[PDB]
From a paper:
A prominent member of these so-called Knallgas bacteria is Cupriavidus necator H16 (formerly Ralstonia eutropha H16), which employs four different O2-tolerant [NiFe]-hydrogenases for generating cellular energy from the controlled oxidation of H2 in the presence of O2.5 Among them, only the tripartite membrane-bound [NiFe]-hydrogenase (MBH) is directly linked to the respiratory chain. The most distal cluster relative to the active site is a [4Fe–4S] cluster coordinated by three cysteines and a histidine, while the medial cluster is a [3Fe–4S] species with three cysteines as protein anchors.
Even in the MBHC19G/C120G protein, which contains a four Cys-coordinated [4Fe–4S] species, oxidation resulted in cluster flexibility, indicating that the binding pocket is optimized for an Fe–S cluster of larger dimensions, i.e., the Cys6[4Fe–3S] cluster. The function of the Cys19-derived thiolate bridging Fe1 and Fe4 in the native [4Fe–3S] cluster, was taken over by the additional sulfide S4, which also formed a covalent bond to Fe3. Oxidized crystals of the same variant diffracted with a resolution of up to 1.65 Å. Interestingly, the mFo-DFc electron density maps of both oxidized and reduced MBHC19G/C120G uncovered a positive density at the former position of Cys120, which is most likely a water molecule based on SAD data.
Residue numbers in the entry:
A (entry chain L): 3 to 244, 247 to 603
B (entry chain S): 5 to 273
Write the structure that this text describes.
């Protein structure tokens, strides 16, 4: 047992293993210890995959890198491509044209929406929603619930909910439950009434059908989804508004994109945000405010979405770092500073010359070292209980000035809130969303459902699994709104006569400096993403990625400090220690992408 | 009534799973609820840990030699196989265990089919395609990074309707989807035939939709349905949106030189 970051870690209790962790991207193992009352008193995050993209990139052409690193992940598809082209452009002093900037922003915001909405419904919702309970719901009461939760959503009649309920029923009555087989249905950890469950399941089905439409924006600009194409110096989708049909982008293609954006805005406003507000309210009323972890103290994002390109002071999700829960002081974060972002491997399956220090990613090293500690139960190829006192993950341990940080939509919303309080006007919309959301959760939704009003502040409500889930939904809404404005600006710029989509001045490596280094950052769906590159004689000398889930899923560092996943699980009661309902609910609130975390 | 699919994930990016759920005809929703029984799939399944693992035994017993094994990604042979760990054991052990009683095996995507990005030089994990590990079962390769959504569901639909694997080419790919090179029906072909090429990004030729051969387009050597079926319900494909094909359905495309290096012997095509 030891204490770190205010958490009292104790591994003397009953050990519980969750392997595989499902409804995530990629491969994770989680172990916890619980005390005599089933409260988690230790948590262990193990990334269970590695591919070695950083090693594979050595010696290749920087112009090709984006395509390799894009394949780090098909869920956050394109965010790595964006970081890569930014990193190469930074290294080579390349400024992309305005239309390329706007198209990339629209693609990024499209990914945010798609990734957030699919995550919540198809990966997260079954931690909050009991599908078998939905079978017992009254269709009439479900219709009435729907009208209170989201008055503007047109799909609200009793017959519509009866139809969905019956298909679900027939499916279950078949005896082949598919994705619902061996679920934790009926657990007391589930608190929603049947009507709320049926509403949510119905939206799970609606979103599965709709998500395929949103990504057609990627298809227009990048050819395909998953894995749309990017380009060092701009975008490949050349513009000819007028032989119009022969160019990748003409007015009709832009109108198509706008139609998809308008649909996105509708879905976020009428389905996604209201569902999360309603589910959050009900779990809040049940007292389930666990899972805050490091969000209560330390949060980080690089900052993103400048309304003036290459001017970070105009970031619409302004970033930086908060420490010790002091929301009155946002420290600037510089990805170029060797003393800020650093990665440790003390408890990771890698080796450094000296593992008592952290390496900034321009000096990063990726040499595998799969070895298990002396207190392991089982063998090298058959682990029963992992030894977290030694090396226990394929995930490296990123820290900021040595501090363990949480990253993600929640981090960005806390930072935006802090920025807005300090007088930053670019953060006014997220501040508004948060204040609106607090009032809905505390007062409006309780009043409408006949529940008592509460008086939680944002500082109390946000650092929690509920809060983490809420911030994701709000971010989706904000990204939809922002890309709606980006579309107008793109169309306006083209109509003014600027059709440029690529700067090719430094496309040929004969124009390059013989060595260079660059960094590209992105506010990826799961948090702060960076790619750091060194170029030598036209080739990649080093390429290091530090990815959002690398931060959140980090194992312990040299100092034994715990990362976001491990901290978030601490001090959480489990209804039944052999059913990981609460572990899954909190882990999933981070939207873990394990392929990302390890690359 | 509904054929079980056990969908396993090795070393992968999850792009093949994502592509699958973009299918419009049929809807993935209808595939899951009405066509297959998707009984194991890490991305979507309610059960985790011991409860998830327990499903594999149950389905394999009850539906012995009558389930489809679908594989996204691949097994690593380095690090004693523990660069991909499932249930504290190497992924290759799960793959071999589930494969032995499968009616048919689908290798989804370039990773499962050929090695994928992780198998590109120097292949630190010795990632190995499914057919080099499972040598005694019928395997259909559905390559692409990822494959087109409707190609993935088209394979499932054929297999469910006929209870047969569709006719395959020498490389194990379905002829109904992989018989044509991209270049055969690519709408920019008349430009290629007229020697009309893009030479620099966003030049006048690019704005007129000229052929992308000189920008590295690998369409002339790449077999897929992209130029006809196209992507995301026929919305576009790489070439229509202005980037050359990078050859993503072809074996070892990652190590066939820069994506922007043109093919040589233009007379060939
Ligand atoms: S083929 Fe491509 S898209 Fe599919 S699971 Fe491999 S890297 Fe990802
Ligand atoms: S080289 Fe590429 S762009 Fe040109 S016609 Fe062939 S497939 Fe189309
Ligand atoms: S890159 Fe791949 S998606 Fe089709 S156009 Fe070429 S085979
Ligand atoms: Cl950019
Ligand atoms: Cl390959
Ligand atoms: Cl070749
Ligand atoms: Mg890294």
């Amino acid at each position: 047992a030891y204490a770190t970051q205010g958490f009292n870690l104790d591994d003397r209790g009953r050990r519980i293993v969750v392997d595989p962790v499902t409804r995530i991207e990629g491969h994770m193992r989680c172990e916890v210890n619980v005390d005599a009352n089933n409260v988690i008193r230790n948590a262990v995050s193990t990334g269970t995959m590695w591919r070695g993209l950083e090693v594979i990139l050595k010696g290749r052409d920087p112009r090709d890198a984006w395509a390799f690193v894009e394949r780090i992940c098909g869920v956050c598809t394109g965010c790595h491509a964006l970081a890569s082209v930014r990193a190469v452009e930074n290294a080579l002093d390349i400024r992309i044209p305005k239309n390329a900037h706007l198209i990339r922003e629209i693609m990024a915001k499209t990914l945010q929406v798609h990734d957030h909405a699919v995550h919540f419904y198809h990966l997260h919702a079954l931690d909050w929603v009991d599908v078998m309970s939905a079978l017992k719901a009254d269709p009439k009461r479900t219709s009435e619930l729907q009208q209170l939760v989201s008055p503007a959503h047109p799909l609200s009649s009793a017959g519509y909910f009866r139809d969905i309920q019956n298909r679900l029923k027939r499916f279950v009555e078949s005896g082949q439950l598919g994705p619902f087989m061996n679920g934790y249905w009926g657990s007391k950890a589930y608190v929603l009434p049947p009507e709320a469950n049926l509403m949510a399941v119905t939206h799970y089905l609606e979103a599965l059908d709709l998500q395929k439409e949103w990504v057609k924006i990627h298809t227009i600009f990048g050819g395909k989804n998953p894995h749309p194409n990017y380009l060092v110096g701009g975008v490949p989708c050349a513009i000819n508004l007028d032989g119009a049909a022969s160019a990748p982008v003409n007015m009709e293609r832009l109108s198509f994109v706008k139609a998809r954006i308008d649909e996105i805005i509708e879905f976020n406003k009428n389905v996604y945000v209201p569902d999360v507000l309603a589910i959050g309210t009900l779990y809040k009323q049940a007292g389930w405010l666990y899972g805050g972890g490091l969000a209560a103290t330390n949060v980080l994002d690089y900052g993103e979405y400048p309304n003036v390109a290459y001017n970070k002071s105009t970031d619409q999700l302004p970033g930086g770092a908060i420490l010790n829960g002091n929301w009155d002081e946002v420290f600037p974060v510089d990805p170029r500073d060797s003393q800020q972002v650093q990665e440790f491997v003390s408890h990771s399956w890698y080796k450094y010359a000296d593992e008592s220090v952290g390496l900034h990613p321009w000096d990063g090293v990726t040499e595998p070292n799969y070895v298990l500690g002396a207190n392991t139960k089982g063998t090298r190829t058959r682990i029963e209980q992992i030894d977290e006192s030694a090396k226990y993950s394929w995930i490296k341990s990123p820290r900021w000035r040595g501090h363990a940080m949480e990253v993600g939509p929640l981090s960005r919303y806390i930072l935006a809130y802090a920025h807005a309080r300090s007088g930053n006007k670019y953060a006014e919309r997220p501040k508004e969303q948060l204040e609106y959301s607090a009032q809905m959760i505390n007062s409006a939704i309780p009043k409408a459902l006949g529940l008592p009003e509460t008086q939680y502040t944002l500082k109390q409500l946000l650092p929690s699994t509920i809060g983490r889930t809420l911030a994701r939904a709000l971010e989706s809404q904000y990204c939809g709104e922002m890309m709606h404005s980006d579309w107008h600006d793109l169309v306006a710029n083209i109509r003014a006569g600027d059709t440029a989509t690529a700067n090719v001045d430094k496309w040929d490596p004969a124009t390059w400096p013989l060595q260079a280094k660059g960094v590209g950052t992105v506010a990826a769906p799961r948090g702060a993403l960076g790619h750091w590159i060194r170029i030598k004689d036209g080739r990649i000398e080093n390429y290091q990625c530090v990815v959002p889930t690398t931060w959140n899923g980090s194992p312990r560092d040299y100092k034994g400090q715990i990362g976001a996943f491990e901290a978030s699980l601490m001090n959480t009661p489990m209804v039944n220690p052999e059913q990981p309902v609460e572990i899954l609910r909190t882990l999933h609130s981070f939207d873990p992408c394990l392929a990302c975390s390890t690359h | 009534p509904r054929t079980p699919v056990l969908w396993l994930h090795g070393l992968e990016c999850t792009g093949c799973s994502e592509s699958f759920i973009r299918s419009a005809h049929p809807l993935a929703k209808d595939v899951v609820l009405s066509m297959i029984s998707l009984d194991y799939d890490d991305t979507l399944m309610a059960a985790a840990g011991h409860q998830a693992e327990a499903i594999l035994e149950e389905i394999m017993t009850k539906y012995k030699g009558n389930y489809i094994l679908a594989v996204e990604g691949n097994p690593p042979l380095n690090q004693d196989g523990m660069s991909c760990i499932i249930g504290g054991r190497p992924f290759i052990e799960q793959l071999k265990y589930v494969a032995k009683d499968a009616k048919a095996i689908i290798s989804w995507g370039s990773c499962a089919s050929w090695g994928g990005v992780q198998a590109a030089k120097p292949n630190p994990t010795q990632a190995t395609p499914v057919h080099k590990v499972i040598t005694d079962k019928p395997i259909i390769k559905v390559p692409g990074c990822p494959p087109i959504a409707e190609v993935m569901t088209g394979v499932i639909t054929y297999m469910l309707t006929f209870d047969r694997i569709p006719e395959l080419d020498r490389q194990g790919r379905p002829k109904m989807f992989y018989s044509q090179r991209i270049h055969d029906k690519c709408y920019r072909r008349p430009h290629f035939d007229a020697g009309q090429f893009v030479e620099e990004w966003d030049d006048e030729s690019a704005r007129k939709g000229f052929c992308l051969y000189k920008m590295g387009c690998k369409g002339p050597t790449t077999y897929n349905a992209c130029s006809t079926t196209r992507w995301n319900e026929g919305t576009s494909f790489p070439i229509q949106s202005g980037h050359g094909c990078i050859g993503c359905s072809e074996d070892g495309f990652w190590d066939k030189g820069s994506f922007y290096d043109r093919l040589t012997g233009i007379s060939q095509f």
